[PDB]
Scaffold this active site. Sequence first.
Site: not given
Lengths: 482, 482, 482, 482
Positions: A52, A125
């Site tokens: 990420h 998420n």
Amino acid sequence: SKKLTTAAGCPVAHNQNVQTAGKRGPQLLQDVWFLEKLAHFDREVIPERRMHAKGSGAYGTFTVTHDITKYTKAKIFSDIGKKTDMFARFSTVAGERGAADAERDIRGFSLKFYTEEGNWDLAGNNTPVFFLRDPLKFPDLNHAVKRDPRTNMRSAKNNWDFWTSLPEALHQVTIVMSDRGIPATYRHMHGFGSHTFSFINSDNERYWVKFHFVSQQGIKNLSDAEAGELVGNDRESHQRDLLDSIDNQDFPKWTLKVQIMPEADAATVPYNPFDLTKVWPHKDYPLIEVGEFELNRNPQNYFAEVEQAAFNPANVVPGISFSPDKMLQGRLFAYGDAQRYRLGVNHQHIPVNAPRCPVHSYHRDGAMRVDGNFGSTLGYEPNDQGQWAEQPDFSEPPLNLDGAAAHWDHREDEDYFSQPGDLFGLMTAEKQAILFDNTARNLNGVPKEIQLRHVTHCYKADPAYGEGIGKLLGFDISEYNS
Amino acid sequence: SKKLTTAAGCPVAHNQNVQTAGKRGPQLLQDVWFLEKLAHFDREVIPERRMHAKGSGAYGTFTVTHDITKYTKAKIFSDIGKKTDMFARFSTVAGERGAADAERDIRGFSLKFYTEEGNWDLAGNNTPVFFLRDPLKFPDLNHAVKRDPRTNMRSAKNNWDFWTSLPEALHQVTIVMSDRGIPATYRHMHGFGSHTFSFINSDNERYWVKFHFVSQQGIKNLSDAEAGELVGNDRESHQRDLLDSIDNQDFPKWTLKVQIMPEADAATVPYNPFDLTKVWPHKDYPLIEVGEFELNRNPQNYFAEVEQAAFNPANVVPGISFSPDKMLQGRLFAYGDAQRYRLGVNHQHIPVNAPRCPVHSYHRDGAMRVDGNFGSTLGYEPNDQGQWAEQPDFSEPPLNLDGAAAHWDHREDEDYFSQPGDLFGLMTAEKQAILFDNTARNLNGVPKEIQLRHVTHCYKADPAYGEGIGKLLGFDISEYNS
Amino acid sequence: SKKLTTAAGCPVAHNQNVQTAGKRGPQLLQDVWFLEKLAHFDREVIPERRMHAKGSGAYGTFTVTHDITKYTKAKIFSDIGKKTDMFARFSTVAGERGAADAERDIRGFSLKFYTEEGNWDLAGNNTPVFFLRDPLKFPDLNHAVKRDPRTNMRSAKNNWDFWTSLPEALHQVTIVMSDRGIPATYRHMHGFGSHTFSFINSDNERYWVKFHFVSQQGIKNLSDAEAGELVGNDRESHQRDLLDSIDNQDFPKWTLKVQIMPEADAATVPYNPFDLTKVWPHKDYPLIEVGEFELNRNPQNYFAEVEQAAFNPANVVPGISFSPDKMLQGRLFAYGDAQRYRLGVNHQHIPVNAPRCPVHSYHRDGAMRVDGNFGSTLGYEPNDQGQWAEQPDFSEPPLNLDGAAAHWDHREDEDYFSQPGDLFGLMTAEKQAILFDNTARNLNGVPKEIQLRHVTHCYKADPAYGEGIGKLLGFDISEYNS
Amino acid sequence: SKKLTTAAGCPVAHNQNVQTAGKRGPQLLQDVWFLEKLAHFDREVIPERRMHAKGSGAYGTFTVTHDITKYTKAKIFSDIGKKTDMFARFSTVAGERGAADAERDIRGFSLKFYTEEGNWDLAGNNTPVFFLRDPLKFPDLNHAVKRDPRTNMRSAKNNWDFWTSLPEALHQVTIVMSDRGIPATYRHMHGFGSHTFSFINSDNERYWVKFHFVSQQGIKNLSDAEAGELVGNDRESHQRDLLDSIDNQDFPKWTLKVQIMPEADAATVPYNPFDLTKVWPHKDYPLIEVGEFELNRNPQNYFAEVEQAAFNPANVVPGISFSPDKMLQGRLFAYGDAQRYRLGVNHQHIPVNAPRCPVHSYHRDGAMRVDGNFGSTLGYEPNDQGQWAEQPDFSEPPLNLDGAAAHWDHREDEDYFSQPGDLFGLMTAEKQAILFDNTARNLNGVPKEIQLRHVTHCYKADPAYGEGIGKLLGFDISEYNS
Ligand code: HEM
Ligand code: HEM
Ligand SMILES: [Cl-]
Ligand SMILES: [Cl-]
């Protein structure tokens, strides 16, 4: 006050020309402003996140709207209308630092709530599930979805070889290959804790819980064709949108809803409730509204506040705990670890990471100690001052166990296909056609035997799902229907 | 406060017993307080200083007592009675972190003055001179005086082989082998800038300057036998003395005095005014008294305030600058360089290192950025906002130069022995005997050819000096006669 | 060749004089050899170890003399006469880099065996026991026995406040205050694993094991007075002895003996077999001879081979494993964690830490990657190449468990005093007198209520033990006999 | 073969399932493979380069074709047909790791030649010039061309405000806004040393020199529209091209040519020959062919060989040296500085960075020391072992100097526009229209006063250049006149 100084506060007289031995002579070592300015310049960069790395963040406010205090003693949830500062970071997964925002990928949905009993980090998420059941596979996932050791490019072969080797990955592969694989903006996707967590109430009873964040802006997506077009113009599309929206006072909101399972049902439900590749059916555990948050303030400095942001799943607050989801367990080690490396051991002294409640955290010294290090306070406990006193009133209830210490084989549960089948079955013809086309083009150049491994898994989820992809790749039904 | 929390502000319930799978079972990973506490513990240590690693610090106040504003425009010296907060660190040189305080060695005399025009760092020594004329030899000096690569112990042969190869080192060797080689406490030694520096006045006139700090407690020393006896009892004698003196309000003072040489004199004097192995005779340039400091406050936390202290000779203030002393020149690079590695690029945010005046220092990002990072302020200059504006009124005058860019051989100046000779000549017979005895015993087990090299240099300083050591070692006078 | 070059292999022409603008001008930046030499010099130091920072190392060889293959399948023990190379590091505990070798302290006894199925690290001590029962107390121990946050010196009050707060510490406190608290050399002390570990045989049967290393040189100690005299002359006494002994070919040797407990006994023995503050009586479990090692080779470079050495208790080999000793469990995390910080993620490529057997370790990238990083080898498993294949044949048997996940209170076992009382009972009148004197003098200046706490514990171990110290401190028996 | 072990070489039995307290219990700490695997994973990332982060590399061979030994004694050029192995990295400038290959930007053209007298690093660009005259402006250029502190996106305002404040920047702004601003591939651009460097011959005579690398593949570019379409499809287009080309045995080649100026001409030429914003006219100094290189091997591992590659401009070889170009002078500090931070002090032991010639580099210790650290070799010079012997034969001749040490104002040279005008004048009508269009669209949304500043500069270069842009922006000629 716009006047330039050194780091030691000395006025800088010359910021345009270096000191030299005559007009056309070599440079002098005693131009110390040059040395300072370039040495700090040479050290601006810190390591990106291992996962990420590409993302955007903003500050906001969570407000309680409903009462769940029977299930949790968490102070954040204690009273209707109670407001709590928070910070969110949204992100892609595989992309590095300047990678395109608008790629086909999971999106991180990472929240820090600055509560009165600590920062609660929920690193979520935009999907309720994930590819893996066991955290040992996580470095392997990274290595499969990022750049090949030799080519320095993503490899469809590497990615699909790995995915097809883990049938449990089918649920999240389906989601990422579906129309929800590319949100149009960060404001138009949902959020999830994904894992089973736990709630602990006033009477020390435990409940298993799922966190759900429902977009109040609705779901909007980009096709591969729309995304490529956008990416050719702007690698920073999603940052752009979040920043501009908040600057335009169009503050995005999400509604927090929870699923709550009494401790005992975990032994009796037909699905493993701790399996990250599975959801809990809404029929069995309906969504229970709790509150909403809105993002309403852009950070003033991206590096200081967003790049340096650290969310640790282990950062929970009284009334909220973990679960034996093996994926969650592994994450309890990896984040603190990755963040101490990436940011320094004292990174929780970075403003965005700091608690907004009383803190008295014991740890001494370490690189870049700027907080006073507790002055002269003794460093050992037990001690005759009662310093560093533990707080036994906050003790969690024990968790019953059964069975030996062992590496238990998760493939004892071979239900890899039913939940993906359920998902596919719910799609419209348009959504199924998108799924098929995305998958087929993603499988381009991938060796036939790997392609066939995937099509077989899709077939086992639902014969129409396998066939939809098989037809596009030019396979006979007999090749994947056994 | 007493109640223990995590770094994120969460109450810690168990600080006595880790979480296990049953009474007699293995430890659980989900004991997240265990992981945090040990992970921080594992990271308490930062690299020690490469030189002067062992040390003691205190805060104090400097007061102007005389008017030298004719020579320097520095704000610290602008008015009689003007007071300035300061921090001092005293140290040995060769010893690591827990090495004995009472060793035969130079002592560091390092001062940081928190002035209204920046922090002025003067990293001085307890001696007016040093071993070396050229900064290239500094790593070599470190390697000769510290631990041998194989034995991991100091080596007399390494040390003396090196010292005897640099006849210019004799001045400082004589000093360290004299009775002044082991100060009894940090309070009973003098301090010096050692180098020639410069003063710049209101009319942009330049003067060359020496800084002298005269102990008001006077000079007290320990013999090798006394120091050994002390070390056997206490490796922390000088820290204990300094801390205890201040805790009992017997604050030590030093008087700042300067030598001031008009710029034009440097070309006309019979000695090299920029040779660090030489002093300026008091007869040529009398001591001019300026002010005094006292040390009156012990740090609350040693790691955060003393260990993390960074003194950079390049941190000068308007009215004070450098000189073409090659040794000073090399230090202009090495300190900031060493400090960025040891402490982090953003170490000037650590409170002891921070200016007390206005600071607008331009540098962005970097590890452990906790100060806001100038928020949204643009980062480039020239810019249309007048941001990061240089301050031309603080410009130093040019220095005239003559000769080509080259590696000029300092050995053109072969005056290695006259100043050591003068120093020796002024010692009483007892002080000379102490010198002879310290040197002879220091040279114990050193190969004879190296011993002879040193005796020859000493003889060249003064025949009685060479012979004093020569006799102790059993040398015939003709062996070092010539 | 002895000729000097840059790191990039360019000849260095000028190592004596820096480049300046004229003979008496400022230094030029383009003297790049100066910049490189000083920049490397500025980065020579890495963080010392957080514990056992002061130490000495040597290579040697282990030879099997007896057959224990009934109990362990470990390759190192497979055949009588089988030789395995090794590296050992001995150390103090509290001292920093540079602290005195001859202090009253535990000595580390750390061994690395280069076996054909991996490096077996046994990071032992010169004592069979330790102060603590739970790994959460370790940073507290460090903080209690090392430098006070304010004074920067060891604190008798801090140390003894902490020890008297943990009655379980009495066993090791008794040992460190006894004549064995200062070994005369590293060769004149025993070594111990201290922890219960496990052996696993060919049939996957598990035995619990203790490792003992019996000095063939015998036990020799120094009194406080003798140690003080030694320290005053030499802070490096034990390094000097080890180095010199090995150079003189007087190779020190130890005999490995083990205690072996069948798995079922652990539940039935009257003492907790996993309690680090207790030993297993030799009467119950006699020493079984295994082999011996000798140290016969000094390292060529101390920094690269000794300072950079990393011993990790988690580095076990097939046939050897752990135990539910909570203290050992905590160590399974801390060392690799401490070592990656101290030495870099890729420290196992440092020659001393590298295995001398087949290694294929999977981890990719990371700082200072010099081994080729497996070239183009794919990085994910499962994969279609059979790459990074696990070795299921080496699987350990499951460990049976019982009871809930909880922070179980170790104070359920209040047997704090019986084994210290036994040890005292075995001492001659002279050894008892040394113990009393050492303790009373160590408690000098410690607040009376803390002194009384220790004497009370000593009293409960044996009335004569308590009274011996009580008399010396001037206490009446009624002050500590209840 | 292909079997998984720990870093210490212990076989790994379980790489699929972590160890738990029963089938559905929490994870156990004692799963040490998990901790190790995740801890290495958590540390895979190092900081990206502060500039030129995005890049591609390959190995090749340089062959001498023609004789320039009259001008240089560099071994690499010593004999016709002599072959020298080498490594090259090509890069963009502003993009981070992950940014699109096909952006409008300077391309880095960085060469490491493994010569018999050292690695010669030549970190060039695909342009003979650069934006700046003084190295103090480099951090300002970085902050202007990269991401804004608040928006985290590139800013046209920031970029053009900065460029328009520096009239000297016009030459390079013209080139980056021309058609050569986006090379179609790395193979289809030229390379340049850019700075004046120097050659030193056998008789120690000095010549000023410029290095040119002429693509044997020809020049090929992409329009903004073509580049945007490509980026939308592939952020890795240029890596892909270089890798596949070499794998297809289509080895890209460049011819080295030099311009050579006798030392005397520097004072007589009508252009500052050390001004990085200027070229030497081919009219005065024609290109002289030297040799060619081809790139013929793709690296085995990108991280270890390309990401960890370090090119330092100070890494010159006998026969090749620097010049008083202020920009080159600054780079002599910054690169080693940045690389020590980014890669570790011992990064030249990384294979790609390692010299193949004799190396005896002196520096000791430092992080991740894996080379043996010179074993027991003494570490000081001068010494009595002939160790670290300097090489005075390689001494460079002095450089004559004139004038005081000062911060000399480069704007004494106001010739900012003539060379950009010469370049404009040589473009076809089509390439001029392309320049106008690229520039006008680049200025979109930039405040009018900044736009006008640029058009004024362009007009000064050539009336038709300014008018070409002025027309597209809708300005009257009188608004930016003369
Ligand atoms: C929870 C308990 C303990 C913890 C957390 C702990 C932690 C540590 C740490 C962080 C280091 C420095 C490691 C490095 O940087 O390489 C160290 C060194 C060491 N410890 Fe422990 N320690 C514990 C108990 C023990 C015990 C019980 C023993 C003996 C049985 C022991 C023996 C040693 C030795 C010999 C060293 C030095 C190794 C060397 O020579 O490099 N420790 N310890
Ligand atoms: C004051 C002037 C300059 C400064 C301070 C500067 C600084 C830097 C820094 C810090 C890096 C990253 C280095 C690393 O981490 O390895 C870099 C990279 C680079 N620079 Fe410069 N730069 C300057 C001007 C130039 C010029 C004029 C050129 C071309 C002639 C150039 C070409 C390059 C190249 C090709 C790279 C990437 C090297 C690689 O491929 O690894 N730079 N620069
Ligand atoms: Cl770390
Ligand atoms: Cl650094």
